Enzyme design. Structure first.
Site, PDB file in Angstrom:
ATOM      1  N   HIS A 174      47.706  57.822  96.892  1.00  0.00           N
ATOM      2  CA  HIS A 174      48.877  57.360  97.576  1.00  0.00           C
ATOM      3  C   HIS A 174      49.026  56.245  98.365  1.00  0.00           C
ATOM      4  O   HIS A 174      50.105  55.548  98.600  1.00  0.00           O
ATOM      5  CB  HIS A 174      49.619  58.597  98.054  1.00  0.00           C
ATOM      6  N   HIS A 188      47.150  53.208 106.946  1.00  0.00           N
ATOM      7  CA  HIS A 188      47.672  53.153 105.528  1.00  0.00           C
ATOM      8  C   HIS A 188      48.592  52.143 105.456  1.00  0.00           C
ATOM      9  O   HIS A 188      49.060  51.707 106.341  1.00  0.00           O
ATOM     10  CB  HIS A 188      47.794  54.319 104.880  1.00  0.00           C
ATOM     11  N   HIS A 206      52.369  50.889 102.702  1.00  0.00           N
ATOM     12  CA  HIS A 206      53.347  51.021 101.891  1.00  0.00           C
ATOM     13  C   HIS A 206      53.841  49.761 101.429  1.00  0.00           C
ATOM     14  O   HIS A 206      54.101  48.806 102.183  1.00  0.00           O
ATOM     15  CB  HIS A 206      54.311  51.784 102.554  1.00  0.00           C
ATOM     16  N   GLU A 239      59.254  50.806 104.305  1.00  0.00           N
ATOM     17  CA  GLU A 239      59.991  52.312 104.538  1.00  0.00           C
ATOM     18  C   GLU A 239      61.123  52.017 105.325  1.00  0.00           C
ATOM     19  O   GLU A 239      62.377  52.452 105.131  1.00  0.00           O
ATOM     20  CB  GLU A 239      58.798  53.176 104.942  1.00  0.00           C
ATOM     21  N   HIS A 241      51.146  51.476 108.623  1.00  0.00           N
ATOM     22  CA  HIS A 241      51.412  52.704 109.566  1.00  0.00           C
ATOM     23  C   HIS A 241      49.988  52.925 110.420  1.00  0.00           C
ATOM     24  O   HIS A 241      49.098  53.115 109.398  1.00  0.00           O
ATOM     25  CB  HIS A 241      51.802  53.980 108.922  1.00  0.00           C
ATOM     26  N   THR A 288      56.560  60.732 106.219  1.00  0.00           N
ATOM     27  CA  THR A 288      57.138  59.902 104.932  1.00  0.00           C
ATOM     28  C   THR A 288      56.598  60.314 103.668  1.00  0.00           C
ATOM     29  O   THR A 288      56.862  59.684 102.729  1.00  0.00           O
ATOM     30  CB  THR A 288      57.306  58.311 105.252  1.00  0.00           C
ATOM     31  N   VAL A 289      55.444  61.033 103.527  1.00  0.00           N
ATOM     32  CA  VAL A 289      54.865  61.521 102.474  1.00  0.00           C
ATOM     33  C   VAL A 289      54.933  63.150 102.707  1.00  0.00           C
ATOM     34  O   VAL A 289      54.853  63.490 103.653  1.00  0.00           O
ATOM     35  CB  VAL A 289      53.457  61.277 102.431  1.00  0.00           C
TER      36      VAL A 289
HETATM   37  N1  V1F Z   1      53.882  57.658 106.072  1.00  0.00           N
HETATM   38  S1  V1F Z   1      53.081  58.320 107.327  1.00  0.00           S
HETATM   39  O1  V1F Z   1      52.692  57.229 108.365  1.00  0.00           O
HETATM   40  O2  V1F Z   1      53.842  59.290 107.877  1.00  0.00           O
HETATM   41  C1  V1F Z   1      51.469  59.350 107.145  1.00  0.00           C
HETATM   42  C2  V1F Z   1      50.904  60.185 107.887  1.00  0.00           C
HETATM   43  F1  V1F Z   1      51.826  60.180 109.153  1.00  0.00           F
HETATM   44  C3  V1F Z   1      49.859  60.902 107.555  1.00  0.00           C
HETATM   45  F2  V1F Z   1      49.391  61.698 108.832  1.00  0.00           F
HETATM   46  C4  V1F Z   1      49.356  60.772 106.410  1.00  0.00           C
HETATM   47  S2  V1F Z   1      48.088  61.806 106.094  1.00  0.00           S
HETATM   48  O3  V1F Z   1      47.001  61.195 105.025  1.00  0.00           O
HETATM   49  O4  V1F Z   1      47.209  61.948 107.496  1.00  0.00           O
HETATM   50  C5  V1F Z   1      48.388  63.277 104.985  1.00  0.00           C
HETATM   51  C6  V1F Z   1      49.515  63.981 105.677  1.00  0.00           C
HETATM   52  C7  V1F Z   1      49.232  65.366 106.041  1.00  0.00           C
HETATM   53  C8  V1F Z   1      49.224  65.560 107.219  1.00  0.00           C
HETATM   54  C9  V1F Z   1      49.021  66.933 107.880  1.00  0.00           C
HETATM   55  C10 V1F Z   1      48.810  67.907 106.735  1.00  0.00           C
HETATM   56  C11 V1F Z   1      48.835  67.747 105.509  1.00  0.00           C
HETATM   57  C12 V1F Z   1      49.142  66.218 104.915  1.00  0.00           C
HETATM   58  C13 V1F Z   1      49.980  59.925 105.344  1.00  0.00           C
HETATM   59  N2  V1F Z   1      49.349  59.920 104.125  1.00  0.00           N
HETATM   60  C14 V1F Z   1      48.176  59.575 103.406  1.00  0.00           C
HETATM   61  C15 V1F Z   1      47.658  60.726 102.335  1.00  0.00           C
HETATM   62  C16 V1F Z   1      48.750  61.111 101.563  1.00  0.00           C
HETATM   63  C17 V1F Z   1      48.135  62.462 100.756  1.00  0.00           C
HETATM   64  C18 V1F Z   1      46.673  62.678 100.497  1.00  0.00           C
HETATM   65  C19 V1F Z   1      45.796  62.007 101.539  1.00  0.00           C
HETATM   66  C20 V1F Z   1      46.446  61.043 102.332  1.00  0.00           C
HETATM   67  C21 V1F Z   1      51.054  59.338 105.629  1.00  0.00           C
HETATM   68  F3  V1F Z   1      51.719  58.696 104.741  1.00  0.00           F
HETATM   69 ZN    ZN Z   2      52.957  55.728 106.071  1.00  0.00          ZN
END
Ligand code: V1F
Ligand code: ZN
Length: 258
Positions: free
Chosen positions: A61, A91, A93, A103, A116, A196-197
């Site tokens: 993603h 990461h 977007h 976003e 982010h 946002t995911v």
């Molecule tokens: N857009 S965002 O900045 O809100 C955000 C996060 F804040 C966030 F913590 C993550 S994450 O990778 O740490 C996965 C989200 C999560 C949090 C708690 C429990 C389960 C899932 C991603 N995303 C990057 C991502 C997406 C999918 C798989 C691996 C990483 C993420 F996109």
């Molecule tokens: Zn993000």
């Protein structure tokens, strides 16, 4: 198997993640004429150690740079936050073309991409994963990227992209200068919202910096050559990975600056 293709993209996420239509969803549109300066926000304090960065990986993603997250060497304090929020991951977007991809959108303006920086409240909670299910659990810094002259501080990232082309690939990534990716001014807007995911949890205090940083077109296009598919699977490209703004539904946005 959520993503950003026709069949699995943002319009369909409510099918598996009902909080998608919640009241504190992100990202949002910021209408500056309605934002109020808040003199009660404290100075933002960013202490980041390049040695905290450990790995970069392709999650399918985005790319994710993960940080060693049992130490307080890299923390975000101040601003709207109570206590110390530990740096967890960075990461990015973008969209399929340079004219939109951020976003958050500011008075109808959409930047090319949005970085982010995700932190979590280790003063209250035992792990990032727990903190993600709590209202004051997470704090995310947003930085916009605008098309302009190339940005040398993206090199350490872009140099690794061929090595993490397929979903699930990873590679060592340390001694990363994250501070230098931030713009010179750290004036920001702040509001209560969500990841946002999927799973779209409403646990994030957003801190969105007003000043964009640069990226060139050629640099941005490299991110779109990442795959959302794993090795041995028919290739599909991650050309866009941004969720559209969701309605404020009564929330108000504060500004650090007047
Ligand atoms: N857009 S965002 O900045 O809100 C955000 C996060 F804040 C966030 F913590 C993550 S994450 O990778 O740490 C996965 C989200 C999560 C949090 C708690 C429990 C389960 C899932 C991603 N995303 C990057 C991502 C997406 C999918 C798989 C691996 C990483 C993420 F996109
Ligand atoms: Zn993000």
């Amino acid at each position: 198997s959520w993503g950003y293709r026709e069949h699995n993209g943002p319009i369909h996420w409510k099918e598996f993640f009902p909080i998608a239509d919640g009241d504190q969803q992100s990202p949002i549109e910021i209408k500056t004429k309605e934002v109020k300066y808040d003199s009660s926000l404290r100075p933002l304090s960013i202490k980041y150690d390049p040695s905290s960065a450990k790995i970069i990986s392709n999650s399918g993603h985005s790319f994710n740079v993960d940080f060693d997250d049992t130490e307080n060497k890299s923390v975000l304090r101040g601003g709207p936050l109570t206590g110390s929020y530990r740096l967890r991951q960075v990461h990015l977007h973008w969209g399929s073309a340079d004219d939109h991809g951020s976003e958050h959108i500011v008075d109808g303006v959409s930047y090319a991409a949005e970085l982010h920086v995700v932190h979590w409240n280790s003063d209250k909670y035992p792990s990032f994963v727990e903190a993600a299910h709590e209202p004051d659990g997470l704090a995310v810094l947003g930085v916009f990227l605008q098309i302009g002259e190339p940005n040398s501080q993206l090199q350490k990232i872009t140099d690794t992209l061929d090595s993490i082309k397929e979903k699930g690939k990873q590679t060592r990534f340390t001694n990363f200068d994250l501070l230098s990716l931030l713009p010179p001014s750290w004036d920001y807007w702040t509001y209560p919202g969500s990841l946002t995911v999927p799973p779209l949890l409403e646990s994030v205090t957003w801190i969105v910096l007003k000043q964009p940083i640069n990226i060139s077109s050629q640099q941005l296009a490299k991110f779109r050559s990442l795959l959302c598919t794993a090795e041995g699977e028919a290739a599909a490209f991650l050309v866009s990975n941004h969720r559209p703004p969701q309605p404020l539904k009564g929330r108000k946005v504060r500004a650090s600056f007047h």
